[PDB]
Design a protein around this ligand. Sequence first.
Ligand SMILES: CC(C)CN(C[C@@H](O)[C@H](Cc1ccccc1)NC(=O)O[C@H]1CO[C@H]2OCC[C@H]21)S(=O)(=O)c1ccc2nc(NC3CCN(C4CCCC4)CC3)sc2c1
Lengths: 99, 99
Amino acid sequence: PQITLWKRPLVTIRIGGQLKEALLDTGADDTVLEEMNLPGKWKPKMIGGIGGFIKVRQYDQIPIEICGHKAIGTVLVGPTPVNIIGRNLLTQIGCTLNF
Amino acid sequence: PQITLWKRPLVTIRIGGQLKEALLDTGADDTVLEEMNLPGKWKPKMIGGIGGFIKVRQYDQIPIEICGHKAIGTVLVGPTPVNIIGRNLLTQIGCTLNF
Ligand SMILES: CC(C)CN(C[C@@H](O)[C@H](Cc1ccccc1)NC(=O)O[C@H]1CO[C@H]2OCC[C@H]21)S(=O)(=O)c1ccc2nc(NC3CCN(C4CCCC4)CC3)sc2c1
């Protein structure tokens, strides 16, 4: 599909038995999801945005379904105000910017 | 152009005769530039990201040429970690997400 930018580019994502709304975010290197207790190994990390850094948990090789397209990769979990789909996954679903 | 997301979507912008690199950012509602001088009236504003809130100066009706395409709109100036072109100007240059 083509998504215009008049409104926030929010789309449905699925990660396990959790369906969530997430921002397709070309300004995000990484994918950052709201707090969720995912299984398996993780590593602590700090990521920085406009107003400073937050502490997140880095989970690797997590399958995530974005608008019905399959992806699998690193997901950062922590106290973000919005679920953010970053470039690590946007490239996997074939996402480009066009103008 | 078509811009892939294997690398940060950084483009050159022209604002007030100066060239800057800025990030095409679909997850940003607003355009936020690193501290710089701009002419005219401005108003104190606050915006929130990951990490919290910052204080910015809001300049209205500022021309920016973004990768060859003209926009004229609101530009926020403050302690953003990177110059970001948000949806308010992305829409003006006809930018969409496609996959
Ligand atoms: C600001 C921008 C440069 C980055 N932000 C994405 C942005 O779209 C954000 C998304 C957003 C939206 C809403 C709320 C909150 C956020 N929007 C935003 O702040 O918009 C504001 C402007 O307009 C307003 O409208 C929306 C909010 C306002 S971010 O959310 O903070 C963000 C996301 C993923 C990410 N991955 C990282 N990995 C890497 C880690 C490793 N390091 C390197 C590794 C070794 C050294 C450094 C590189 C970064 S660092 C990093 C930072």
